Structure 1
Amino acid sequence: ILSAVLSQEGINILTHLPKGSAEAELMSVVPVFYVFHYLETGNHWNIFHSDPLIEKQKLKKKLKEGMLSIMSYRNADYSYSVWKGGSASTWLTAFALRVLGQVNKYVEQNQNSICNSLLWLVENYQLDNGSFKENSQYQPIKLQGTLPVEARENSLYLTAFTVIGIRKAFDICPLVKIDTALIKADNFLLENTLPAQSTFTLAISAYALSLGDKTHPQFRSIVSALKREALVKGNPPIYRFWKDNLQHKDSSVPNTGTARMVETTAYALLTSLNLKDINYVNPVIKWLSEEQRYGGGFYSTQDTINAIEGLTEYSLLVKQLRLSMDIDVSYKHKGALHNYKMTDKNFLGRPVEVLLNDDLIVSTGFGSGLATVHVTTVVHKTSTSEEVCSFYLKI
């Protein structure tokens, strides 16, 4: 187990915010939602030193204020914008549903809203091949950061980024029509990622399919690719991360070795954290942890939302994984054969024999962990059975 917490202050800043410009106003308020998801879901109300119970409600007040605050950027037709006069942006629309979906857990949303907002993207902004398009009035945004990309490479980023929103908030409006939309889109990402264009593209793409069918042939192919680009310090690895680069793209400059990587490796971390391959994940969060020092800070809120959801998911993957089992072996008809309570302290409780010829039933109620049952059976057969022999012998 590794420690991944937050400074008492850090949170303080995030919750307090800075104020003035409408610009990055939204950017102003997104973090609170994450600092709540992480603070509630991984229970950590306790950090404060004051009264945790009312402090929880203090954030809630800020959280609902902030909830309508985002609505400001919602249009007529339910599509998110920066300015109503402004323009409707396919980018922000996805990014809203992504923020909302995580929040819906503990702050109930306007259901009918979420839906029409969804149906906007799907019915209007999806090609015949699943891929999504940014609407127009194209605007570089300070918040967006590393998102800008070249050639089709941007179709991929966006399709995957909008997939993420739709995955995140699908629960709230499970529509037969938008599940289909997900099917078509997912296929794009699988069937159109493989010859990898960027590390940043590989990663979100990986992460987006990571929120879908995580057993898929093509997908695990992709995940392998990403998993092979990784950087390490110390072997066996103590530290692991990803840098954004391709073999064509070298200059004697500081900028290429540029933060973009924190975002890309954050998408990797989030990908694997879904696969629940903690072995892979450990050197990353140690390093991402270690990152603040090496990194200085996370340049823009975009990655900082993903880093936080990382630390969140991990601290609650640990929790799922701990062994508190209560296994029971019994004969279906004849009596109760023994049964053993298995924990961290007393794992691999025993081996026991099977006495009687009654179907065997191994079975825990609700419990937390991972246990392995082996049923090695021992039998004797004559020589001249087809099973073993193929010839007629004598001597």
Structure 2
Amino acid sequence: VGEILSAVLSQEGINILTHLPKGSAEAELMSVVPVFYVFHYLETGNHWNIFHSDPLIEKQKLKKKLKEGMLSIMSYRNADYSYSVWKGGSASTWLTAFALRVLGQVNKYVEQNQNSICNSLLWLVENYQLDNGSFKENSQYQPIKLQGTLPVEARENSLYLTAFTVIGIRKAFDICPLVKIDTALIKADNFLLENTLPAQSTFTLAISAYALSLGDKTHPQFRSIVSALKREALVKGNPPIYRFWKDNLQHKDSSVPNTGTARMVETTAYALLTSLNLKDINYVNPVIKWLSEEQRYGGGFYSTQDTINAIEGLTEYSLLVKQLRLSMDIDVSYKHKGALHNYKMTDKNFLGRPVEVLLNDDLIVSTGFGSGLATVHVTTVVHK
């Protein structure tokens, strides 16, 4: 596994359960969607077994608050399975994609009725799938600035909208796989790639790279975008202790979170999520350490977006870390002939000895589900 970082939420997770009063401006949505993400973070499991240092979040209380938020989010759904904050407001493709993301998370414990989700997906694609860029946003009065965020609307906010819609679709698709949704994903990914070839502003590059990381992790131009992002990363120390991205003279000091820090934290969190999709732990570690500083203390604007992406990144890091934990009883055997050897591959016994393959038969290597990654090589030695 290499290096592991104890990046974690404080007891402030309890405040994010009891979070700032539910109500108008969808302060309820701002309160609950963090409750959901905290839910999933705790669902990583440590924060019920070990959290005794702090007050255990009561399972049932968390469940209750979860349920309340589910009902709320439903209540804001548009009748046509769009969404709006105002009852009579416009459909928002952006906020609907945000719903789709959150409701993609919830299923990990409480599935949302997939029919409604599928209808929302069909509405969003069928109404707004343009064929050169896609999902241009409808005439919603404004984004609620703390609920949404400010992309660089000065240039081609369709890039932002496409990225967010793609990400929402990604989080929904596994619960509503649809071939035409797949096709619209392909289209949007293609546009987002081709229009990210000019670097524009690095927030766009990071969010587009994350969208593609959800898609083809290994497309050549995807990797070229990644190699650009990794060029834009600032670092402290020759071996990077911290790595992050800035724009727009955010190097100015700010004692409190603000829209510039919001953009900073968002673009960094998207780069983190992209790198976690790459499973590049040696690259991710200094980003996680940077994020744990809470420089710009409180972080972002303390916007919903930055907070949600930050927690998503932290959960995905702790997940990938515990995935790489090596445990694999690799049993190797002949096809026709018997078993050969049974390496108890462990963080201690991580390297079984070379075994000469005596018998002249095909060799099948197998393992229990175990954990982590391993590699095994046979060499064959012969005379000519």
Contact persistence 1:17–1:29 (CA under 8 A) = no
RMSD: 3.1
Shift in alpha-carbon separation, 1:261–1:252, aligned structure 2, 3 A: closer
CA distance in 2, matches of 1:6, 1:249: 27
Matching residue of 2:217: 214
Number of residue pairs matched by the alignment: 380
Shift in Å, 1:205:
0.6
278, 281, 285: which one aligns with 1:278: 281
Shift in alpha-carbon separation, 1:188–1:367, aligned structure 2, 3 A: same
Shift in Å, 1:82:
1.3
Q: How many percent of aligned residue pairs carry the same amino acid?
A: 100
Contact persistence 2:257–2:301 (CA under 8 A) = no
Shift in alpha-carbon separation, 1:48–1:345, aligned structure 2, 3 A: closer
Shift in alpha-carbon separation, 1:217–1:366, aligned structure 2, 3 A: same
Contact persistence 2:332–2:341 (CA under 8 A) = yes
Shift in alpha-carbon separation, 1:172–1:335, aligned structure 2, 3 A: closer
Contact persistence 2:328–2:372 (CA under 8 A) = yes
CA distance in 1, matches of 2:120, 2:254: 43
Shift in Å, 1:11:
3.1
Per-residue CA deviations over 1:163-202 (Å, capped at 9, x if unaligned) read 1111001122212221111111111111221111111100
Contact persistence 1:153–1:201 (CA under 8 A) = no
Per-residue CA deviations over 1:259-280 (Å, capped at 9, x if unaligned) read 4111100000011111111010
CA distance in 2, matches of 1:304, 1:7: 14
User: Which one is further off, 32-41 or 241-250?
Assistant: 241-250
Per-residue CA deviations over 1:227-268 (Å, capped at 9, x if unaligned) read 111010011101111112499999999989644111100000
User: Which one is further off, 37-46 or 249-258?
Assistant: 249-258
CA distance in 2, matches of 1:236, 1:287: 14
Shift in alpha-carbon separation, 1:50–1:223, aligned structure 2, 3 A: closer
User: Which one is further off, 274-283 or 18-27?
Assistant: 18-27
Shift in Å, 1:43:
3.5
Shift in alpha-carbon separation, 1:14–1:298, aligned structure 2, 3 A: farther
Shift in Å, 1:19:
4.2
SS, match of residue 79 in structure 1: coil
Shift in Å, 1:109:
0.9
Shift in Å, 1:339:
2.7
CA distance in 2, matches of 1:179, 1:169: 11
Contact persistence 2:132–2:191 (CA under 8 A) = yes
Contact persistence 2:332–2:365 (CA under 8 A) = yes
Shift in Å, 1:347:
1.1
Is 1:183 the counterpart of 2:186 in the alignment? yes
Per-residue CA deviations over 1:75-129 (Å, capped at 9, x if unaligned) read 2211100112222212111111111111122112122111111111100111113
Shift in Å, 1:24:
3.1
Q: Gaps spanning 5+ residues in structure 2: where?
A: none
Shift in Å, 1:148:
3.3
TM-score with structure 1 setting the length: 0.88
TM-score with structure 2 setting the length: 0.91
Shift in alpha-carbon separation, 1:7–1:54, aligned structure 2, 3 A: closer
Matching residue of 1:363: 366
CA distance in 2, matches of 1:256, 1:302: 11
Shift in Å, 1:42:
3.9
User: Which one is further off, 290-299 or 368-377?
Assistant: 290-299
User: Which one is further off, 144-153 or 353-362?
Assistant: 144-153
Contact persistence 1:323–1:344 (CA under 8 A) = yes
244, 247, 255: which one aligns with 1:244: 247
Shift in alpha-carbon separation, 1:125–1:246, aligned structure 2, 3 A: farther
SS, match of residue 345 in structure 1: coil
Shift in alpha-carbon separation, 1:244–1:64, aligned structure 2, 3 A: same
Shift in alpha-carbon separation, 1:328–1:212, aligned structure 2, 3 A: same
Shift in alpha-carbon separation, 1:41–1:198, aligned structure 2, 3 A: same
Shift in Å, 1:140:
3.7
Q: Gaps spanning 5+ residues in structure 1: where?
A: 381-395
- Matches for 1:1-395 after TM superposition, within 5 Å: 1-46=4-49, 48-49=51-52, 55-144=58-147, 146-245=149-248, 258-292=261-295, 299-380=302-383
CA distance in 1, matches of 2:251, 2:153: 14
Contact persistence 1:239–1:284 (CA under 8 A) = yes
Shift in alpha-carbon separation, 1:280–1:80, aligned structure 2, 3 A: same
CA distance in 2, matches of 1:320, 1:83: 42
